[PDB]
Amino acid sequence: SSESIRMVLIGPPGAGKGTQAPNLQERFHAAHLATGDMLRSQIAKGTQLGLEAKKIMDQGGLVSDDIMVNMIKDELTNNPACKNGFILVGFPRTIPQAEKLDQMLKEQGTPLEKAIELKVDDELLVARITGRLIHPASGRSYHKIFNPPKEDMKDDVTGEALVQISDDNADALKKRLAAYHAQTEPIVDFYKKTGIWAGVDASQPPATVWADILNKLGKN
Amino acid sequence: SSESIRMVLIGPPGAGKGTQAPNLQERFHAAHLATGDMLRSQIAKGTQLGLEAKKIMDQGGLVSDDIMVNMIKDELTNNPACKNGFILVGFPRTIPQAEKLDQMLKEQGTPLEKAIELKVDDELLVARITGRLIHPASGRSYHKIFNPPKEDMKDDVTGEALVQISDDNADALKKRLAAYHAQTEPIVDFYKKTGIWAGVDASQPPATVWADILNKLGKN
Ligand SMILES: Nc1ncnc2c1ncn2[C@@H]1O[C@H](COP(=O)(O)OP(=O)(O)C(F)(F)P(=O)(O)O)[C@@H](O)[C@H]1O
Ligand SMILES: Nc1ncnc2c1ncn2[C@@H]1O[C@H](COP(=O)(O)OP(=O)(O)C(F)(F)P(=O)(O)O)[C@@H](O)[C@H]1O
């Protein structure tokens, strides 16, 4: 095993998934699989799933549980980086999706090993979301206080300007945190019942949260 | 005038919006605006709007209303193809969106000249969706029964294989078409109000529908 990870990283907006996923990524050289990013990449390719997703999506609807799970499957089966495990972010989001994912990873014979849930109190989140900065290109995020860029409003690797989002606000966030707890509790619960769940304290500085995770992972 | 147009093309899936859109382009030399494609392009280009849209939905969410109109406004202001006019397809879809789209075009100085609704019966529609073949790379559509390709499952101009990506499923179709109606009836009613709506029987053969459209537009 060791130097392979098949896991699911969950947490509310503001917990740092975008900050940890990349650390995990480089360590295990695993594939960082984001659902929306997979959706878009597939629509670009002119694939049957991509086109089917495209038409049902750009028509005011959502893509089916199985179209998602069939795409994840396509990725495991073809993505080059999917051979040293993966890091699934933002999926599942309903029980049946967690259900069909397990039933298909089962098929593939490559089960999830961990479901890391990043924990942090809302009050801390709606306060920390106020000062986030994203390199629009890479999506590399920084925080003006907690993980500041080395140069005033500049991306560490490109020297390009960082930007803050209009939705990066207290009111808008409160609605999203509420929605998050209501829909993630059953999935968290699903992962507890199968024994792969692990809580991590996301209230700690980045490097401490990194270490906490690397430890709950059990590799090494 | 005469060979300039600013309009919306509304109608149920399987109605024929994609099949007629290029005529309108020939006739008027204007841009084809499909919000779905607009969004995905913004996202991929690394714009603040791309960034926000890909944050909202990529977290299983629904992209504003304002992000949409503002993204359309970007097309208009800065896209050359949009200096002749534009053939807006698949927007608006709600009334707020219609009110917001109107308000911006009002401020802009270029309000819609026409809203064309493609009408066809639900029984036919499900049939239109079912037999649909598609050339992925170019997006060109065919119907294995009402408008077949010259060579079996082959794109007329490229010879490249066609695909069946229209969610070929019994119930789901009739259920979705019901959704379109409940969603769309107010947009049409909103446009008869504004005095710019024109309905078109899209059940007739393609060229017969185009002549109906061109006459309805009243620019020829
Ligand atoms: N341990 C930490 N302590 C304090 N701030 C942190 C910590 N880790 C990350 N942050 C940050 O708080 C903000 C949110 O983190 P990040 O942007 O990386 O992930 P998330 O907020 O979880 C999200 F992308 F995934 P999204 O909005 O998509 O849910 C950023 O400003 C980031 O710099
Ligand atoms: N008037 C017509 N008579 C017969 N077949 C037609 C006619 N117009 C279009 N078709 C077709 O019916 C199907 C639907 O057409 P098309 O793919 O062009 O538009 P629409 O279904 O209206 C859509 F693409 F824009 P969308 O999926 O965006 O909602 C295709 O199979 C195409 O061949």
Q: Nearest 5°: phi and psi at B62?
A: -110, 120
CA of B14 to the centre of ligand 2 (A): 5
Which ligand 1 atom minimizes the distance to the CA of A147? 33
Give, for A180, the enclosing helix (H) or strand (E): helix A170-193
Q: Are B216 and B118 in contact (CB under 8 A)?
A: no
Nearest-CB residue to A58 (from B36, B137, B183): B36
Q: Are strands A132-134 and A197-201 parallel, antiparallel or unpaired?
A: unpaired
CA-to-CA distance for B162 and B91, rounded, in angstroms? 27
Task: List beta partners, residue B9.
Answer: B89, B116
- Please identify which residue in the block is written with the tokens 């893509």: A63
Q: Check: CB of residue A17 under 8 Å from CB of residue A118.
A: yes
Nearest atom in ligand 2 to B209's CA? 1
What is the Cα–Cα distance from B146 to B13, expressed in whole angstroms? 16
- How far is the C-alpha of B119 from the C-alpha of A105, rounded, in Å? 45
What's the DSSP call for residue A6? E
CB atoms within 10 A of CB A93: 18
The answer to whether B20 and B206 are in contact (CB under 8 A) is: yes
**How far, in Å, CA of A121 to CA of A107, rounded?**
37
Return residues 73-112 of A near B (CB < 8 Å): 90, 93
Whether the bond into B22 is cis, omega within 30 of 0: no
Sign of torsion over alpha carbons A142, A146, A152, A157: negative
Rounded to whole angstroms, how far apart are CA atoms A144 and B82?
39
3-state DSSP call for residue A132? strand
Is B160 within 8 Å of chain A by CB? no
Q: Do the bridges between strand B86-89 and strand B6-10 make them parallel or antiparallel, or are there none, so unpaired?
A: parallel
3-state secondary structure chain B: CCCCCEEEEECCCCCCHHHHHHHHHHHHCCEEEEHHHHHHHHHHHCCHHHHHHHHHHHHCCCCCCHHHHHHHHHHHHHCHHHHCCEEEECCCCCHHHHHHHHHHHHHHCCCCCEEEEEECCHHHHHHHHHCEEEECCCCEEEECCCECCCECCECCCCCCECECCCCCCHHHHHHHHHHHHHHHHHHHHHHHHCCCEEEEECCCCHHHHHHHHHHHCCCC
Q: Alpha-carbon distance A135 to A158, whole Å? A: 9
Residue range(s) defining the domain that contains residue B104:
1-220
The CA-atom distances, in angstroms, between A66 and each of A42, A52, A74, A99 are 15, 12, 12, 11
Burial class (CB in 10 A: 0-12, 13-18, 19+), B60: middle
Angle at B37 between CA B164 and CA B69, to 5 degrees: 140
Check if B177 contacts A (Cβ < 8 Å). Answer: no
**HSE-CB for A15 with a 13 A CA cutoff:** 23
Given a contact cutoff of 8 angstroms between Cβ atoms, the answer to whether A86 and A35 are in contact is: no
Count up the domains in chain B and report the number. 1
* Chain centroid to CA A28: 16
Which of A6, A3, A220, A2 is CA-nearest to residue A113? A6
Query: Nearest CA to B199 among B177, B187, A92, A160?
Result: B187
Interface of B with A in 42-71 (CB under 8 A): 43-44, 46-48, 50-52, 54-60
List CB contacts (< 8 A) between B59 and chain A: 13, 36, 90, 176
Residue with tokens 């005033």: A152
CA distances from A156 to A122, A133, A140, A147, A161 (A): 29, 12, 9, 11, 10
Chain B interface test: which of A17, A55, A187 (most B C-beta within 10 Å): A55
* CB contacts, 8 Å: B52 with chain A: 165-167
What secondary structure letter does DSSP report for A82? G
Which ligand 2 atom minimizes the distance to the CA of B90? Answer: 28
Q: Give CA separation, B204 vs A82, B62, B147, B181, in Å.
A: 50, 36, 12, 20
Q: Whose CA is nearest to atom 9 of ligand 2?
A: B16
Please tell me the distance from the alpha carbon of residue B188 to that of residue B199, in angstroms, as a whole number: 9
Please report, to the nearest 10 degrees, the dihedral formed by the alpha carbons of residues B145, B149, B150, B151 taken in order: -100
- How far away is chain A from the Cα of B136, in angstroms, using its nearest Cα? 5
Residue A63 CA to residue A47 CA, distance in Å, equals: 14
Cα→Cα distances A2→A5, A218, B194, Å = 8, 9, 66
Locate B205 and state its tokens: 């053969």
Q: Of A44, A92, A33, A39, which is closest to residue A61 (Cα–Cα)?
A: A39
Contacts of B73 (CB under 8 A, 6+ apart): B104, B108
Q: Which atom of ligand 1 is nearest to the CA of A13?
A: 29
Which residue do the tokens 């699989």 mark?
Answer: A33
**R_g (Cα) of chain A, nearest Å:** 18
Measured distance CA(B74)–CA(A171) in Å, rounded: 27
Contact B59 A52 (CB under 8 A): no
Q: How far is it, in rounded angstroms, from Cα B71 to Cα B190? A: 22
Q: Resolution of the deposited coordinates, in angstroms?
A: 2.4
CA atoms of B57 and A85, how far apart (whole Å): 26
From A30, A144, A172, select the one nearest A89 (Cα to Cα): A30
The residue whose CA has the least distance to atom 4 of ligand 2 is B146
CATH code where residue A130 lies = 3.40.50.300
Q: To which residue do tokens 């500041």 refer?
A: A148
- Residue to mutate among A35, A40, A168, with most B CBs inside 10 A, is A40
Helices (H), A29-141: 35-44, 48-57, 65-78, 95-108, 122-128
Query: Which 8-state DSSP code applies to residue A85?
Result: E
